[model samples]
Target: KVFGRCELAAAMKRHGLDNYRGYSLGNWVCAAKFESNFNTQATNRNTDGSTDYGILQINSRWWCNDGRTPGSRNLCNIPCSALLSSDITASVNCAKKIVSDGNGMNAWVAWRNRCKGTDVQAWIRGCRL
Candidate 1:
């Protein structure tokens, strides 16, 4: 099963993202929800021969040349050290990118930027971001 509400906060804390609320989780959740139904056990063929898997849907060690899967590291195959780096931003941003990828959300991430404000999803989620 996927993580619950506080679970997201916990992930944010773990990732040193105290500004979690400022960032967008809705789109990430939207993408994750679509891909794996939030199962956290999802995986797919990457542009590389390896596979991106898990909650963040990462391939674990794409650059490490280890070719490890989700279990390669700890959570989602992303080691704490690597997770501490800027790469973490890439995944979250990837979700946003997917949504705003010009073609847009592909029916996911909802809203379609149809609203008329910043942090629209945040407002819907009772968040200030």
Candidate 2:
């Protein structure tokens, strides 16, 4: 599913992303825009032969097991396939784990490059939260 900006905002908010671990809802919205453009099925293969999955593009090398990423930690204890579902519950949960692990939002390069040190409020502007 490709979510509209406000639509993604609302869904993420419902999952407690707002102000999660010092990252605001706008931060998440901004990262998601750059990471996967709100597409639930988005995937990217890294040069290391690992893959990123789902809306947040959680990586197979560390977060989820894809049976292909060498030395995967699978810290989320979930199959990489789970992240591709439209439900997004698994994606959100894994993201929370990533943040809780002290990486903050910088766990995603897109967030660091695009959302960090910037006013992301515009990402959710005019949205009725």
Candidate 3:
């Protein structure tokens, strides 16, 4: 809870996402807590010698600056994941950046409104979170 409200519902309000149709911010945060224990430094073993890193669980292979071919262990190179391994907050901000950019949300939101939007404006006006 950044301001003492950690539940999904409250988070939504704080983030202005209250009008989201068929979705719950609460559930996502619950997932975040469970996945990382609210610890950004959480790591998961990946057989061989790789590890998942960061808040959104960004894998080194996916975001690393090097071209490690996805399987080679960095003998002397800290896996790219380690660069952000301690920055858990970046994950949440990262995902939000992706969403806010509207890469796949505008159309989705339009259809979602048609399917379940009781008041579409509510999504943009005083969404609460």
Model 2, 1-129: lDDT tens digits are 998999999999999999998788999999999999999999999999999999999999999999999999999999999999988899999999999987788889999998898999999999999
Candidate 1 lDDT, tens digit per residue, 1-129?
465544543453455444343445554443444444454545566554555544455443432223444434333233423322323454444333333435544423223333223443442264333
Residue 114 alpha-carbon offset, candidate 1, angstroms: 13
lDDT score of residue 89 within candidate 3: 36
Q: Rank the candidates by lDDT, best first.
A: 2, 1, 3
What residue runs in model 2 are displaced by over 4 Å at the alpha carbon? none
RMSD of each: 8.5, 0.8, 9.3
Runs off by more than 4 Å, candidate 3: 1-23, 64-89, 96-129
Better of 2 and 3 by lDDT: 2
Output the number of the TM-score-best candidate: 2
CA lDDT of each candidate? 0.42, 0.94, 0.41
In candidate 2 the C-alpha lDDT for residue 103 amounts to 72
lDDT of 3: 0.41
Worst 10 residues of 3 by lDDT: 104-113
Local error of candidate 1 at residue 65 (angstroms): 5.5
